Each structure stands twice: as C-alpha cells, then as structure tokens.
Amino acid sequence: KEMPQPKTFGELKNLPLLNTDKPVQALMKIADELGEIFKFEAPGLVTRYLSSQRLIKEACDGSRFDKNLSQALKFVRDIAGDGLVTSWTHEKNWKKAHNILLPSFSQQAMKGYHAMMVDIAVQLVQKWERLNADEHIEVPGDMTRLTLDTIGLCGFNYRFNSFYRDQPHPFITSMVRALDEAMNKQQRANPDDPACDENKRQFQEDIKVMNDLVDKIIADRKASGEQSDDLLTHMLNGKDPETGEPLDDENIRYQIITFLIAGHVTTSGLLSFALYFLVKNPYVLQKAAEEAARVLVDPVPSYKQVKQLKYVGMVLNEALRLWPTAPAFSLYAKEDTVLGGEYPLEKGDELMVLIPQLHRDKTIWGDDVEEFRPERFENPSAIPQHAFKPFGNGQRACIGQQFALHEATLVLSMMLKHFDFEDHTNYELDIKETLTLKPEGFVVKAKSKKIPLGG
Amino acid sequence: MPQPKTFGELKNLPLLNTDKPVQALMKIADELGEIFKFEAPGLVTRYLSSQRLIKEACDGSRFDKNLSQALKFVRDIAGDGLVTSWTHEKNWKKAHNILLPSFSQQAMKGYHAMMVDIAVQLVQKWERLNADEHIEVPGDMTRLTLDTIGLCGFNYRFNSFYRDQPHPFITSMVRALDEAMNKQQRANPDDPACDENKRQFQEDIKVMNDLVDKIIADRKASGEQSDDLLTHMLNGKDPETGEPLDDENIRYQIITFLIAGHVTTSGLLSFALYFLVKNPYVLQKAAEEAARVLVDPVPSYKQVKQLKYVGMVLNEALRLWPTAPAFSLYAKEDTVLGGEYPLEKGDELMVLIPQLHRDKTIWGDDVEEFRPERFENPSAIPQHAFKPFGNGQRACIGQQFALHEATLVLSMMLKHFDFEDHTNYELDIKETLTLKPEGFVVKAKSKKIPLG
Ligand code: HEM
Ligand code: HEM
Ligand SMILES: [Cl-]
Ligand SMILES: [Cl-]
Ligand SMILES: [Cl-]
Ligand SMILES: [Cl-]
Ligand SMILES: [Cl-]
Ligand SMILES: [Cl-]
Ligand SMILES: [Cl-]
Ligand SMILES: [Cl-]
Ligand SMILES: [Cl-]
Ligand SMILES: [Cl-]
Ligand SMILES: [Cl-]
C-alpha cells in the first residue's frame, strides 16, 4: 500500500506543519485524518508515525527494530550526553550504565527509597495544610517541587528544598529553557544559520546552570561521611559485570543530569494530569479517596500499604493512557523488512510511536477512548501486548517505571486522604509541550480533612 | 560542472552560514576555479569568476539582469525601483528614461558646489579634532555620502555631521539590509520564532519611509526652485509613453537612491583610504597630485577631472573590493556558456566581482597588490575584465556621480591631512550585501591649509 502523508511545502516537505508550540497534539490530529500510519518528511528527516496497536506490536519486536534517537533526543544529547536516555543501544556506555544502575530499581532498592519519598510527600501535604482561606494550589509547580526533591533525595542524598522556594528551582528554569530550545530547534531546517548564535549561547548558559548543580551534588557526596547505597553510590562505585569497568567521570556527570531530568519531569506531569482527571470526574475521585482512607490507616504510609492501593494505580495508568507524559519514542529497522504486511522498510528506516494515538486505538479500548475510567485497568492481564506503552519498549524501556508509579501512588493517595479538592476555576485543559506534556495553568483549591501526619 | 560540498537536502546552503558569505564564496572560487554550481532549498545558480566566462554572461543579447535572492528580499524595501525591478518591468525603463538626465555632464556640473559643501564639512570636522582623538572612517564616509545624495538629489540636509551617532535612517537601513542578507540562510522563514525579525524589519522600513515622507513634504512646501533628481521623479514624463512615475514608484525611487546613492560610495572611500595608509608610497603620489591640482581654496569641477592618479586609486580599490560585490543574470534562451556548459532558458548566473578582479590571465600574478598604475592606460584593459558598476543597460546609473564625489573628497582629504594607521588596523570586511572595512580608524594630522 502507498503510505499516507500530510501536506507538503516544496523542499521543506512536512516541516511547516510543526511550526507550532504543540507539535505532538498537531501530530495526533494528522493521525486522526490519515490513520494508523503516515510518512513525515523534513529536510534531513524521514520518519513514519504509527498509531495502531496492530502496527506498533511489530515495531516493538526487538529482533527487528532498535531504539532510535529522534532529532529531539539528538539535541538533548547536548545536555545529557551518552546517558541512558540519549545513548544508542550499541554505544558502550548504554549497556554498561544499564547493568551498573539497574540494581538501584530493584524491590529492595524501592523499599529503601520509601521513607525518603514519604519525607517529601509530607512536605507537600504540609504546604497545602498551611494555606489560608481562598488561597489555591498551582498544581504542576507543586508536583515539580515534589518530584525533583524526591529524585534528589532518593537518588543523590541531596536536598533541593524546592518547598522552601516561592518560585521554581533555578535548575528547573534552565532545564525548561534548554529542552524548549531542543523542541524549537527541530523546526530550524538550517540550525547553523548565523542568526541562531544567541539561542546557542543561551542554550549553553542553561546547560551550565544544570551542571553547576551536578557539581554541587558530586562535591557533597565526596565530602559526606554517610553510608549511602543510592543511585549515585552505584554510579561512583558500581562495576559492569561484563567488562569489570566503572563509569568514567564524564559519563557519571551525564547520568546525574539524565536522572535529575528524567527522574522527575514526566512524573510531575502524570500527577498533574491524574489530579486533573480526578477533579473532572468526582465519582472517580471519591472512589480513589475511599481506597486511600481504607488502606492508609497510619499517620504515614508504609511500603506494603502503597502496594495495596490498587485503584489509585488504575487512576495513574488511565491518566497515562490519555496523556502519556513522554508521548513518543523512535525506532529504526535493523534489517530490510515489511511492516503490517503492507509497508516495505529498508534497513535504517525510522518509526515514531505516537503513544497518545496508540492509547486511543478503538479496536483495543472500545468506542469511549476519550473518556476517563480507571476501570479499564481492572484486569491488566486482559490488555493486549503493546497496547499500553507509556514507559517505552524492550530493553530500552523506562528504568524508572516502578520508581515513578510508587512515588505517584504514594503522593496521590496521601493527597486524597488528607484533602477534598475543588476545580474552582472550571479549568480548561491546556497541554504545554516541552518534549514532555503537562496541564499548564492547572489550579485547584484544597479543603483539609484535618487528619494529622507523623514521621 | 564543479560544485562544492553538499549537506543532504540542504545542498550547499550550510557553506554560507557565515557573516561574510561573499568572502566564503571567493574561497570556494579559489578551490574550484572559474565556475561552480551552488544549490540550496529553492535555489540554483552558477558563480562565475573568470573574464573568459563573464564576458559571455555580459552579452545582453543572451543574458538579462536577474534578481538574486538577495535583491528579491530588498524588493520588500525598494519595491520596483531601478535597482530591484526586472528589466521587463514597465517601471524600470520608464524610470530609467526619466531619471537618466539627472546624471548628465550638465547635471554633474550643478551637483559640484553641493558636493563641496558636504566635503568641506568633513574636512572641518577632522580639522577640529583634539590631539588625543581619532577618526572612525566608515562612519564619517557615511555621514558625507548620505548627506551628498540628500542635498544633490533631493535638496535636503540630513546634517549627519551635527550628529555624534549614525543617522537613524542609517541604523534602520543597515538593520533592514542585514535582515535581507540573513534571510538567504533562513530556510523555514514562517516559523513563529521569526515573528520578531519580521516586526523589526517592518519597523526599520517605516523609519526609512518616514524620511521619505519628510523629503516629499519639504519639496512640496519649498518656495525655492530645484532641478534635481526629485524634480525629475515628480515632473519627468516618459518620452516613450508621455506619463510620469506614479506616487508608489516615486517613493521606491527615493528609497532606492538614498541607499544606492551613498552606501557603496562610503565603502569605496573607506577602502581607498585603507589601501593608501597600507601603501604609503601610493598615498604620497596621490597626495602630491592633489596638492598639484587643487590650487584653489576649494576644488572646481574642472580640477576634479584632472585628478587622474586619485581616479586610478579609486579604480584599484574597486578592483580589490568592489563594494557591490555581485550581480546576477539569467539566460534569455537555451544557450551554451564557454563552449561546455549548456544552460536552459531562465538559468541563473552570479558574477563574483572580487574574483573576476583577481583573474591572473588579465591582471598578472600580483593580483593581491594595490597598484593604481594598473589603470594608467584604461584602453588596454580587456572588455568585461573590470565590472564594479555592473553591466549593460542595467549598469550603475550613478557611476559618474560616485566617482566624482569620491575623487573630490579623497583629494581634499589628502590635500589637507597626513594620515596615520595608528592601530595597525587589520582588515575586517563586514558584509551587509555591500562591503566595508569595519572598525577602520586613523589619526589625521592637519597640514593647516585654509579652506574657502
Ligand atoms: C510517569 C513517569 C515516566 C514516564 C511516562 C516515562 C517514560 C519513559 C519512556 C517512554 C522511555 C523510553 C524512551 C525512548 O524509548 O526513547 C523512558 C526511558 C527512560 N526513563 Fe522514564 N519515564 C517516567 C519516569 C522515569 C523515572 C522516575 C526515571 C528515573 C528515576 C526515569 C528514567 C528513565 C531512563 C534512565 C530511561 C532510559 C532507559 C534506557 O534506555 O536504558 N523515567 N521513560
Ligand atoms: C562606488 C560606488 C557604487 C558602486 C560600486 C555601484 C555599483 C552598482 C552595481 C554593481 C550595479 C548593478 C546591480 C545589478 O546588476 O544588480 C548598480 C546599479 C545601480 N546603481 Fe550603483 N554603484 C555605486 C554608486 C551609485 C550611486 C552614487 C548611485 C546614485 C546616485 C547609484 C545608483 C544605482 C542605481 C539606480 C542602479 C540601478 C540602475 C538600473 O538598473 O537601472 N549607484 N550599481
Ligand atoms: Cl531554518
Ligand atoms: Cl556513597
Ligand atoms: Cl475527563
Ligand atoms: Cl516492553
Ligand atoms: Cl528489546
Ligand atoms: Cl503550569
Ligand atoms: Cl510591469
Ligand atoms: Cl594592501
Ligand atoms: Cl607602499
Ligand atoms: Cl544590456
Ligand atoms: Cl565601521
């Protein structure tokens, strides 16, 4: 079959279609018009956007397709080097860091992180408990305070103290500016245009701000007398079984930056979206709050209790279905091959998995794909393979998946235990794109249930 | 046909990701020779560097003026004025016939007193500098040349020497022309990220048109009788058609002449003084002519015509750094260039003038040396070897105006001052479509010869 393709603009081809600050949402609309697959071309770019489970289950076959670095990830390489997210599977530092750092996401590691997650989550509840009458909550800002501080403490034994600051942490501001440049730069067909020197300088300035924090974390660890076994301990001391080598200092810096970014941004979005969907669906909020009150019988949650919050987990997965906060990943053909029986591909041909569209495949989920109902995830073993991919695929899947879901389940159930929530502005969903997704401007009011906390 | 390194679908575009594209193109020409193809998104052209091929491109029966991408962008500023119009556009020939008498010998003799007025202001500024002070040469050459076209062409005094900084028209003009130049490298121009460039470009065009408005209103209100460029724009009838230029085109012509009428002449004067201070033996010979010929307190028209060596200095400065360094042509029909490059109707050529002017088969092996004596016998220079003022019916209409102004001013500078290259200035050629030696500074020591 001949592959659908959206409107072309001469030698720019499809490039002008993404002259917007919401490209992923723009691509979802093209997918609605063109269907399960369409080609997308720009100067120096050929890729194919996949939106059906039928085709994406083939693309998730690791014997036939490997992870590709999209243009966006290549630009992010200037920030995160050959860290785990922005390295090729064949680069020696991917496999090496993967084996060195995977033990930091074992069950025993998670049980060790729990108390530190509780530390930050209690700070969030306390902030909201202490608001005055008619004050409201800026939800993404506060979810970012929590998730950045959580990965800082759990991964690096470092306190960013984001809740002690009225404005976003400086690292956040520079990160957003850097990643925003990475998103914008995709539309620069000729990025070495002399006029781009200022963006490049600002880009380097922001990377410097982020590396200044990395420098502080490393100096802090070197000076500390505390016995840790967190991520940073493994980065500094773990040896790859295959090679017997540790990560060198250059790659450690890249991993720190990688985990400071990847370990909070998408989790902040998820929590923001989850709370958005709850206040838009009060019957779901009430059901999730009932589970929280029944399970969380202690002043602070235990690890075991968080594992029993089944419905909250369903809520989080259904929020990831509708708005997966890392909404696409890229693949390339390892060999000449035919996709879906209809689309011949040459070795090196690139695919984009458009996760929000996948997650709206009506052949999988039914006709009501736009509706928010966690009950879809009652029986997870019934969901077809590769229908639900908010955490990527295969050996290049998200290494932090269980970290994120444990954190988000913990925090959301504690929010639901301790407060009633009002959508006092009748907020209109506005999804900001900075590679990742978030509900910009989302605000709520919280009314405390006056249930006390502990340690 | 030779072609430089390509970059996928961007073709040759990334080779001109520089502030100095013409100088980059000269280096490609050094490597690839008399002709190379250059492609970009929406662009195919062929850069010519040899007199052998350029003499054919200058055959008006085979090739007509083309609007390069740069000139198409300048069209947003100067519309269908004489520089940015197509030859077959009605307003080109109509305006050409109506304004050509403004550049006759009769008209030049009338401009002379007004050129001397501005030249005298230049000299008196430098006479009045304190010992610790120096000259910013291009800035003062731009003060002079803009005021000269304003006064001679439009009977309007911009009074650039009464301003410590560049004239606002200049600042906006440069910024607008810099946008036009940079847009050649801007492949996705309708990205919203470009909105600010568009806003600024519109703002700078408005500043330039604000000056136009003031000139037009000044003439309307004037009780003095002028017979200058503006008189012919407003009242000249096209003999071939009996009709005058319309108001829209007149505005484009005023903008055109305010820009074209000064910017390249400012650069020429700047380069000429640069080469003189770098070649003191030539400076001495030129200064000796000025002192021998300019026997009066201010130069006369006749005296300027006797400044033969100063004229040779200016031509040699135009040889090495022609301040409008390229022009474009297209094939009127299918044809063969140089016996081996078939062209189809509409194919474009670029004449890379600085490389033409370094053709060793014309000028000899010492093409980089500054030697005005090259032009001692102008008739012995082959046709189409020396093309600083363009070609054919689309050649510079202001050529004699520019050379009279620069000869007058340079000879007065040399008559009245000794010059010192006190910083040992390193040539840095800024490109804004046109060329100038950016940052060129000197100290001037007066000879204390009174003015008139
Ligand atoms: C809801 C929260 C999260 C979502 C939706 C998410 C999503 C994803 C996705 C889609 C990928 C695959 C990228 C690709 O194929 O190009 C990925 C990879 C990755 N994620 Fe996450 N992530 C989340 C949380 C986290 C957390 C909390 C961490 C760290 C603690 C983390 C660290 C990583 C790393 C290191 C990789 C690259 C792994 C590798 O390729 O070896 N992520 N994530
Ligand atoms: C050294 C100083 C100057 C140089 C090097 C120069 C150079 C040139 C060149 C190369 C062209 C041809 C452009 C093309 O083919 O696309 C041209 C055209 C033109 N120049 Fe000049 N010029 C100078 C001074 C002036 C002055 C003083 C004026 C006005 C008083 C002027 C007005 C024009 C006009 C109106 C045209 C377009 C003529 C037409 O096509 O009908 N120039 N000039
Ligand atoms: Cl571009
Ligand atoms: Cl440690
Ligand atoms: Cl909803
Ligand atoms: Cl998987
Ligand atoms: Cl795999
Ligand atoms: Cl926000
Ligand atoms: Cl016409
Ligand atoms: Cl020299
Ligand atoms: Cl010398
Ligand atoms: Cl001609
Ligand atoms: Cl300068």
Residue numbers in the entry:
A (entry chain A): 3 to 457
B (entry chain B): 5 to 456
Sentences from the paper on this structure:
CYP BM3 from Bacillus megaterium (CYP102A1) is characterized by high turnover, and by mutation of the natural variant it has been transformed to a biotechnologically important enzyme capable of regio- and/or stereoselective synthesis of a variety of organic compounds, including human drug metabolites. One mutant, the M11 mutant with mutations R47L/E64G/F81I/F87V/E143G/L188Q/Y198C/E267V/ H285Y/G415S has shown to be highly active and able to metabolize a diverse set of drug compounds. In biocatalyst design the M11 mutant has served as template of further BM3 variants. To analyze the possible effect of ligand binding to the promiscuous BM3 M11 variant, we present here the crystal structure of the M11 mutant of CYP BM3 in complex with dithiothreitol (DTT).
